[PDB]
Amino acid sequence: AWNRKRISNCVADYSVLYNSASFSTFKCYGVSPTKLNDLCFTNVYADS
Amino acid sequence: FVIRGDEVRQIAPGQTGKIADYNYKLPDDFTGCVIAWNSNNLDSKVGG
Ligand SMILES: *[C@@H]1O[C@H](CO)[C@@H](O[C@@H]2O[C@H](CO)[C@@H](O)[C@H](O)[C@H]2NC(C)=O)[C@H](O)[C@H]1NC(C)=O
After folding, report:
1. Whose CA is nearest to atom 16 of ligand 1?
2. Is the dihedral of CA B29, B35, B36, B42 positive or negative?
3. Which portions of the sequence form the region Integrin-binding motif (chain B)?
4. For ligand 1, is residue A20 a contact (CB within 6 Å)?
5. A19, B8, B42, B47: which is deepest, by most CB within 10 A?
């Protein structure tokens, strides 16, 4: 059972998600993480 | 140099991680061989 918390209409950031919590694994598919700041996506979905 | 076993994967061509991206980064065209081996006895003491 998973929850799609759909995200829309705001301004994100991802550098903050690199140091505060030292994640065990971080595998950015189809997109090199470091460049996530400088492009605008469509209809981001989160799963948990 | 000596780094922990978990970060051994990080020290390789085209890989991410804190030390790899902040301390020592291998070039993409690297043509060499990397060697690793524990020395626990040498890295263990009474006073640490
Ligand atoms: C969830 O955890 C993160 C840490 O991974 C929290 O981020 C910290 O929050 C405090 C309070 O705002 C800041 O002082 C710290 O600077 C943040 N950590 C770092 C390293 O900067 C975050 O607040 C937590 N979120 C929730 C909703 O509880």
Report:
1. A20
2. negative
3. 4-6
4. yes
5. B8
